[PDB]
Design a protein around this motif. Structure first.
Motif, PDB file in Angstrom:
ATOM      1  N   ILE A  49       0.771  -1.182   0.050  1.00 32.76           N
ATOM      2  CA  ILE A  49       0.072   0.040  -0.058  1.00 32.76           C
ATOM      3  C   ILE A  49       0.917   1.157   0.079  1.00 32.76           C
ATOM      4  O   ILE A  49       1.746   1.366   0.634  1.00 32.76           O
ATOM      5  N   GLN A  65      -3.465   9.879   4.658  1.00 34.17           N
ATOM      6  CA  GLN A  65      -3.930   8.814   5.499  1.00 34.17           C
ATOM      7  C   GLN A  65      -4.733   7.683   4.525  1.00 34.17           C
ATOM      8  O   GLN A  65      -5.693   8.144   3.838  1.00 34.17           O
ATOM      9  N   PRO A  67      -6.574   5.023   4.568  1.00 35.50           N
ATOM     10  CA  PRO A  67      -7.916   4.584   4.535  1.00 35.50           C
ATOM     11  C   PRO A  67      -8.845   5.631   3.869  1.00 35.50           C
ATOM     12  O   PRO A  67      -9.600   5.412   2.751  1.00 35.50           O
TER      13      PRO A  67
ATOM     14  N   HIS B  10       5.246   1.799   8.418  1.00 31.81           N
ATOM     15  CA  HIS B  10       4.622   2.815   7.963  1.00 31.81           C
ATOM     16  C   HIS B  10       5.202   3.641   6.836  1.00 31.81           C
ATOM     17  O   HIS B  10       6.150   4.241   7.160  1.00 31.81           O
ATOM     18  N   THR B  14       4.725  11.724   8.597  1.00 36.88           N
ATOM     19  CA  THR B  14       3.865  12.598   9.809  1.00 36.88           C
ATOM     20  C   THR B  14       3.138  11.668  10.298  1.00 36.88           C
ATOM     21  O   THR B  14       2.073  12.379  10.958  1.00 36.88           O
ATOM     22  N   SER B  15       3.115  10.444  10.300  1.00 40.24           N
ATOM     23  CA  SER B  15       1.986   9.594  10.798  1.00 40.24           C
ATOM     24  C   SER B  15       2.310   9.586  12.405  1.00 40.24           C
ATOM     25  O   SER B  15       3.775   9.784  13.142  1.00 40.24           O
ATOM     26  N   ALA B  19       6.014   9.128  14.665  1.00 39.52           N
ATOM     27  CA  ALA B  19       6.474   9.662  15.967  1.00 39.52           C
ATOM     28  C   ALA B  19       6.547   8.884  17.106  1.00 39.52           C
ATOM     29  O   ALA B  19       7.672   9.141  18.039  1.00 39.52           O
ATOM     30  N   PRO B 101       0.880   0.084  12.388  1.00 36.90           N
ATOM     31  CA  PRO B 101      -0.459  -0.004  12.392  1.00 36.90           C
ATOM     32  C   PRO B 101      -0.935  -1.351  12.451  1.00 36.90           C
ATOM     33  O   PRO B 101      -0.473  -1.846  11.260  1.00 36.90           O
ATOM     34  N   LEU B 102      -1.914  -1.637  13.155  1.00 36.75           N
ATOM     35  CA  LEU B 102      -2.686  -2.869  12.952  1.00 36.75           C
ATOM     36  C   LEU B 102      -3.437  -2.736  11.420  1.00 36.75           C
ATOM     37  O   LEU B 102      -4.107  -1.704  11.039  1.00 36.75           O
ATOM     38  N   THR B 146      -0.608   0.575  16.722  1.00 38.84           N
ATOM     39  CA  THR B 146      -1.963   1.400  16.552  1.00 38.84           C
ATOM     40  C   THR B 146      -2.885   0.943  16.112  1.00 38.84           C
ATOM     41  O   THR B 146      -2.830   0.100  15.085  1.00 38.84           O
ATOM     42  N   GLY B 148      -7.277   1.709  14.410  1.00 42.54           N
ATOM     43  CA  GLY B 148      -8.553   2.550  14.192  1.00 42.54           C
ATOM     44  C   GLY B 148      -9.461   2.129  15.157  1.00 42.54           C
ATOM     45  O   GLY B 148     -10.154   3.090  15.708  1.00 42.54           O
ATOM     46  N   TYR B 154     -12.239  -4.505  20.963  1.00 43.18           N
ATOM     47  CA  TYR B 154     -11.337  -5.716  20.953  1.00 43.18           C
ATOM     48  C   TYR B 154     -11.481  -6.469  22.343  1.00 43.18           C
ATOM     49  O   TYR B 154     -10.549  -7.175  22.618  1.00 43.18           O
ATOM     50  N   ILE B 191      -6.531   5.661  17.585  1.00 43.86           N
ATOM     51  CA  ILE B 191      -5.410   6.756  17.571  1.00 43.86           C
ATOM     52  C   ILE B 191      -5.870   7.730  16.832  1.00 43.86           C
ATOM     53  O   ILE B 191      -5.622   9.137  16.753  1.00 43.86           O
ATOM     54  N   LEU B 203       2.951   9.293  23.989  1.00 37.65           N
ATOM     55  CA  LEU B 203       4.238   9.453  23.406  1.00 37.65           C
ATOM     56  C   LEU B 203       5.057   9.482  24.852  1.00 37.65           C
ATOM     57  O   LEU B 203       5.998   8.659  24.746  1.00 37.65           O
TER      58      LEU B 203
HETATM   59  C1  LIG Z   1      -4.889  -1.643   4.973  1.00 38.62           C
HETATM   60  C2  LIG Z   1      -5.385  -1.274   6.202  1.00 38.62           C
HETATM   61  C3  LIG Z   1      -5.832  -1.951   7.214  1.00 38.62           C
HETATM   62  C4  LIG Z   1      -6.317  -1.715   8.343  1.00 38.62           C
HETATM   63  N1  LIG Z   1      -6.875  -2.843   9.235  1.00 38.62           N
HETATM   64  C5  LIG Z   1      -7.293  -2.378  10.625  1.00 38.62           C
HETATM   65  C6  LIG Z   1      -7.614  -3.398  11.414  1.00 38.62           C
HETATM   66  O1  LIG Z   1      -7.855  -4.583  11.244  1.00 38.62           O
HETATM   67  N2  LIG Z   1      -7.893  -2.783  12.719  1.00 38.62           N
HETATM   68  C7  LIG Z   1      -8.051  -1.798  13.320  1.00 38.62           C
HETATM   69  O2  LIG Z   1      -8.418  -1.454  14.441  1.00 38.62           O
HETATM   70  N3  LIG Z   1      -7.639  -0.727  12.164  1.00 38.62           N
HETATM   71  C8  LIG Z   1      -7.193  -1.067  11.144  1.00 38.62           C
HETATM   72  N4  LIG Z   1      -6.739  -0.111  10.186  1.00 38.62           N
HETATM   73  C9  LIG Z   1      -6.612   1.264  10.673  1.00 38.62           C
HETATM   74  C10 LIG Z   1      -5.140   1.732  11.099  1.00 38.62           C
HETATM   75  O3  LIG Z   1      -4.921   0.811  12.235  1.00 38.62           O
HETATM   76  C11 LIG Z   1      -5.125   2.989  11.629  1.00 38.62           C
HETATM   77  O4  LIG Z   1      -5.267   3.797  10.732  1.00 38.62           O
HETATM   78  C12 LIG Z   1      -3.609   3.188  12.143  1.00 38.62           C
HETATM   79  O5  LIG Z   1      -3.298   2.818  13.475  1.00 38.62           O
HETATM   80  C13 LIG Z   1      -3.456   4.796  12.225  1.00 38.62           C
HETATM   81  O6  LIG Z   1      -1.974   5.198  12.773  1.00 38.62           O
HETATM   82  P1  LIG Z   1      -1.176   6.100  12.189  1.00 38.62           P
HETATM   83  O7  LIG Z   1       0.311   6.208  12.567  1.00 38.62           O
HETATM   84  O8  LIG Z   1      -1.527   6.111  10.538  1.00 38.62           O
HETATM   85  O9  LIG Z   1      -1.882   7.454  12.397  1.00 38.62           O
HETATM   86  P2  LIG Z   1      -2.149   9.045  11.704  1.00 38.62           P
HETATM   87  O10 LIG Z   1      -3.458   8.609  11.234  1.00 38.62           O
HETATM   88  O11 LIG Z   1      -0.801   9.149  10.682  1.00 38.62           O
HETATM   89  O12 LIG Z   1      -1.967   9.655  12.999  1.00 38.62           O
HETATM   90  C14 LIG Z   1      -2.962  10.012  13.809  1.00 38.62           C
HETATM   91  C15 LIG Z   1      -3.024  11.246  14.525  1.00 38.62           C
HETATM   92  O13 LIG Z   1      -1.610  11.552  14.883  1.00 38.62           O
HETATM   93  C16 LIG Z   1      -1.292  12.595  14.830  1.00 38.62           C
HETATM   94  N5  LIG Z   1       0.187  12.752  15.142  1.00 38.62           N
HETATM   95  C17 LIG Z   1       1.150  12.560  14.067  1.00 38.62           C
HETATM   96  N6  LIG Z   1       2.288  12.884  14.612  1.00 38.62           N
HETATM   97  C18 LIG Z   1       2.074  13.198  15.997  1.00 38.62           C
HETATM   98  C19 LIG Z   1       2.993  13.676  17.107  1.00 38.62           C
HETATM   99  N7  LIG Z   1       4.281  13.732  17.007  1.00 38.62           N
HETATM  100  N8  LIG Z   1       2.370  13.999  18.152  1.00 38.62           N
HETATM  101  C20 LIG Z   1       1.065  13.990  18.231  1.00 38.62           C
HETATM  102  N9  LIG Z   1       0.172  13.543  17.176  1.00 38.62           N
HETATM  103  C21 LIG Z   1       0.720  13.392  16.187  1.00 38.62           C
HETATM  104  C22 LIG Z   1      -1.850  12.966  13.492  1.00 38.62           C
HETATM  105  O14 LIG Z   1      -1.654  14.040  13.002  1.00 38.62           O
HETATM  106  C23 LIG Z   1      -3.179  12.229  13.487  1.00 38.62           C
HETATM  107  O15 LIG Z   1      -4.097  13.529  14.004  1.00 38.62           O
HETATM  108  C24 LIG Z   1      -6.256  -0.479   8.969  1.00 38.62           C
HETATM  109  C25 LIG Z   1      -5.699   0.433   8.121  1.00 38.62           C
HETATM  110  C26 LIG Z   1      -5.247   0.081   6.961  1.00 38.62           C
HETATM  111  C27 LIG Z   1      -4.671   1.125   5.717  1.00 38.62           C
END
Ligand SMILES: Cc1cc2nc3c(=O)[nH]c(=O)nc-3n(C[C@H](O)[C@H](O)[C@H](O)COP(=O)(O)OP(=O)(O)OC[C@H]3O[C@@H](n4cnc5c(N)ncnc54)[C@H](O)[C@@H]3O)c2cc1C
Ligand SMILES: Cc1cc2nc3c(=O)[nH]c(=O)nc-3n(C[C@H](O)[C@H](O)[C@H](O)COP(=O)(O)OP(=O)(O)OC[C@H]3O[C@@H](n4cnc5c(N)ncnc54)[C@H](O)[C@@H]3O)c2cc1C
Ligand SMILES: Cc1cc2nc3c(=O)[nH]c(=O)nc-3n(C[C@H](O)[C@H](O)[C@H](O)COP(=O)(O)OP(=O)(O)OC[C@H]3O[C@@H](n4cnc5c(N)ncnc54)[C@H](O)[C@@H]3O)c2cc1C
Ligand SMILES: Cc1cc2nc3c(=O)[nH]c(=O)nc-3n(C[C@H](O)[C@H](O)[C@H](O)COP(=O)(O)OP(=O)(O)OC[C@H]3O[C@@H](n4cnc5c(N)ncnc54)[C@H](O)[C@@H]3O)c2cc1C
Lengths: 271, 271, 271, 271
Positions: A49, A65, A67, B10, B14-15, B19, B101-102, B146, B148, B154, B191, B203
């Motif tokens: 991805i 993002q 999703p 990941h 910016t994620s 971080a 991320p999960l 992390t 969604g 869970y 998250i 963090l």
């Molecule tokens: C293919 C796919 C499958 C998935 N399957 C599942 C599943 O089976 N189960 C499930 O529960 N989820 C699932 N998800 C969701 C996924 O787990 C979450 O979207 C993911 O954990 C989010 O983490 P991230 O690092 O992308 O956060 P981001 O969305 O990048 O960040 C989240 C927040 O943190 C902020 N941030 C960034 N840096 C900092 C910082 N330094 N300090 C403070 N805030 C900060 C960002 O700006 C944002 O507001 C799936 C996603 C995908 C794409």
């Protein structure tokens, strides 16, 4: 005549996995199915991805993002063509067979990545309609798995522990989440130690099963109707269901074990 | 000073995942650790096993069998250099953090494929010495995940079912199989719905934990000494152990539930 | 005894190409040569250049430049082992035979990639000493090529045009650039249409040639002494040479035709 | 609105080659072209021909002949899916741009292998209709090449010799053989030594050219009508053409120089 998609995750045409794919195709065609294939290795399918999955303008390229961006691309028609091709196969299919060797207690990376790139939100799942209400609820899916390890290793008393637990995140978390009815897995244990004549029998038994696959009882998962599907309720099991279950010896499934005995072979055999 | 390897899965700098990687690195260095990274996306890591993982003549190119061929390459020094580089990081590391991320109830495909290409036989595991006797038994591993979905989803009563079951194939089947002591996972739920101030606290909490990570009690898995580890015995639990366990309310672990209650939070909290 | 390296680019052991490799090896050994082989398909050879060819610390990973980075790796000893092994065969060899089917008017991709990964700067060429002053000037190289098309198709009046033009970028641009003296190519035309008895004679004629290969006159290329080999002069031919050549009917070679008649069979026959 | 395929052969997204691909895509889309890409490195494109390119039953597996077997697979529909996907892009495209760095006086191995696996008999060429009668005769192709060496090195007097000779086996032997009309190459010399403002101008000039690319006069090759196109005649130039040409000072093209002066810039400029 119904439509089948066979997704194969093995690099070698000489493999037993390839033989099982060929057997499935032959048996289904003989009974008048249309059969489409996704041989991921032969396709050189890209399993990672990324932003390159979206060919249109991103909503927020500074804070990408996957999703949200992929869903937008799906709706507006700007997913990468390779993804679109797989989504069209899935849309067409009534039955989806996944044929793969067990690797590190799960699906091969190339197949994991196929789920990640192809099962896009709205297309394959929506929270508004999780699990039995999902987009693929009119479809059936089945895992056909080969292993190195023997069946005993994956028994309740086996070193690896219960295969039912290994199957759960795939069958419930990936397939059932999207709506699929999940059929009993075809489990082919220690295929590297199986004699030639027995391997021939495995192929024949798989073809035989496929003759009537659509009529089988699917595996049992807890229906979504048992849960309050909103955030105020935390997507938790309804109080009246919880009260009812308190007097029962067994939990409902592997993931809904409720701190009790898991019903035997929940992810392997239908009730 | 001890040595840490942080494997990140990941694509976005910016994620929140990124971080958490940065926070881990900073906290470990503050306590005098040497910290090495495998940022799989930034590395353009190739996650797909193939014959090109062997940088020379194959033993049997007509019947290519990745397990045997990769082990031979490992022993003869003909593994692809990208794999060798990761193996060297692992050899050096005392602590290995997996930050991801999960995705579809498991690790991202890029990380799954890292396991597949990097955890080669003899190097990372052997049948002669599975689980607690494995090569990485002097190392500790921890998942930082992390999601969604919310924590309630869970929980035992949650629509997704028990997170302990989701974690099992990774923590037991991948990490513990190779010998690792597995520490309690850092689980960061929903998250995407967490307010800015609370994210800052997440963090900080992770950094705080890491200050004393090496002193923690690891998760409980059934010791291999409970099993007869040979083909004749079917890798089954010893009869005397089976007899003894019939008096215990809870199974040994998630996979070794033995048809009884799973010990609560077996894959989330240490005894 | 001198030392020979035979580089073969054909997948089939049943091929005429493989027969030519076997014939060459037998004839050279009979005359007391030591013969080493690079059967690229049998070696599972990776033909694609990338940063994975360099196992040490890159000078500039953010702006990866293969030429500069590979040269550094060559000098510091951190090229990929498969490349190093090929370089050692080359260093040892007096004579290098390239045996391949003509494919798309050139070398097979697997052989093109062998040049790309193996002919690293400083090792195989330097700007300071191009062409006849290059590192392989004590070595001799020869192409042994089979074609589908007949000889007439590659004659001056043939539909494909002059084979001398086809050979030029390989013989001048790859082999001679690195210093090799290039011997007359063994050109085996329309091998698919050659009768059995004639093919036997082709093998015998090749063995016969090889008995005295080291004594042959090599192909003519313009000596580097005819050129001003610096940026200010634009690496152009010396004026006194240009003046002298205006009285010659033929250009110096295929690439140095100078807008005149190409000397006949410049890349096929020695003067 | 016409359709373009851009085939890129460079590993680095930071490269000038990648910038030229992006510039081409932007300029063509701005003029209402549909633009598809084959970024061979990003695709991890498999460039090695083998039996695995044919997924069906081979005609003669004991004596595997890639030309005959691939053609059968093409006709029967059992070419490897990755090949089929490229063939579909080609079938759709009106214009095909090849963007690559010059490597060892030719195309990168990964691009050579793309030609080898994708330009299958019957699909891309046949003997019965070579060159101007070939399957792609309604399409146009163009090479966009970057070099390390300066333009002077590739002048007539330059140490490397005439670039027209280097281009010939690609433009005539690969592209024109299949029927393509070949446009003037975009030749970007010594791009590593080009000042910043001039590099910006290179990108702009390429975009400008592409605005009207379809209206350009293609390169001149000898029409097939000048030849007797059958085995008995040896695919030789017709006697009456030979007689007519005998009194002309210049040959017809680089490969059809006929032992006389090559028309200047035959492979670089349209006449
Ligand atoms: C293919 C796919 C499958 C998935 N399957 C599942 C599943 O089976 N189960 C499930 O529960 N989820 C699932 N998800 C969701 C996924 O787990 C979450 O979207 C993911 O954990 C989010 O983490 P991230 O690092 O992308 O956060 P981001 O969305 O990048 O960040 C989240 C927040 O943190 C902020 N941030 C960034 N840096 C900092 C910082 N330094 N300090 C403070 N805030 C900060 C960002 O700006 C944002 O507001 C799936 C996603 C995908 C794409
Ligand atoms: C990275 C990795 C991780 C792994 N992790 C696990 C794990 O976690 N747990 C586990 O249990 N295993 C694991 N394995 C082992 C893996 O599951 C097995 O190697 C795999 O299931 C074998 O299936 P195959 O199709 O490759 O068999 P093959 O070895 O390719 O084929 C089996 C036999 O069938 C024969 N055959 C082929 N075609 C036919 C035909 N038409 N008719 C009859 N016979 C035929 C073959 O020639 C061979 O003799 C792992 C392997 C890898 C590479
Ligand atoms: C992708 C591709 C592109 C091509 N492009 C071109 C091109 O640009 N120009 C061109 O002219 N051709 C081209 N060809 C054709 C190619 O050059 C010929 O097919 C090739 O040279 C044939 O050589 P071979 O070793 O495969 O012969 P084979 O077909 O394998 O063998 C030739 C004959 O020799 C026999 N034989 C095998 N071993 C022996 C032995 N020991 N003694 C006697 N007889 C033996 C075989 O049975 C057969 O009759 C191309 C082919 C491919 C696949
Ligand atoms: C195996 C091999 C064989 C070779 N053989 C030959 C040969 O036979 N003959 C020969 O002449 N050369 C040869 N070369 C050299 C090769 O052709 C050049 O290195 C290549 O063409 C350079 O192109 P690039 O895109 O790699 O440029 P880069 O080095 O990536 O970029 C060139 C310059 O453009 C800048 N740039 C990047 N993006 C932009 C942008 N958007 N706007 C403006 N500027 C930008 C870069 O920062 C840099 O300053 C060979 C190289 C290799 C690796």
């Amino acid at each position: 005549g119904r439509r089948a998609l066979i997704v194969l995750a093995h690099s070698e045409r000489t493999s037993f996995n390839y033989a099982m794919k060929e057997a499935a195709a032959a048996a289904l065609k003989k009974k008048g199915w249309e059969v489409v294939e996704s041989d991921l290795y032969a396709m050189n399918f890209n399993p990672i991805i990324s932003r390159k999955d979206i060919t249109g303008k991103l909503k927020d390229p500074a804070n990408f993002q996957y999703p949200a961006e992929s869903v937008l691309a799906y709706k507006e028609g700007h997913l990468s063509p390779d993804i679109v091709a797989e989504q069209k196969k899935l849309e067409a299919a009534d039955l989806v067979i996944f044929q793969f060797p067990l690797q590190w207690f799960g699906v091969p990376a190339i197949l994991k990545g196929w789920f990640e790139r192809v099962f896009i939100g709205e297309f394959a799942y929506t929270y508004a309609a999780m699990y039995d209400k999902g987009p693929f609820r009119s479809k059936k899916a089945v895992l056909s798995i080969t292993t190195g390890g023997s069946g005993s290793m994956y028994s309740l008393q086996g070193i690896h522990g219960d295969m039912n637990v290994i199957l759960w995140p795939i069958q419930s978390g990936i397939l059932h989440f999207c709506g699929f009815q999940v059929l009993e897995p075809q489990l082919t244990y220690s295929i590297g130690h199986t004699p030639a004549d027995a391997r021939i029998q495995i192929l024949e038994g798989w073809k035989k099963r496929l003759e009537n696959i659509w009529d089988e009882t699917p595996l049992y998962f807890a229906p979504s109707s048992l849960f309050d599907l909103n955030f105020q309720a935390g997507f938790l099991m309804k109080k009246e269901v919880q009260d009812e279950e308190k007097n029962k010896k067994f939990g409902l499934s592997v993931g809904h074990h409720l701190g009790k005995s898991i019903p035997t072979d929940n992810q392997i055999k239908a009730r």
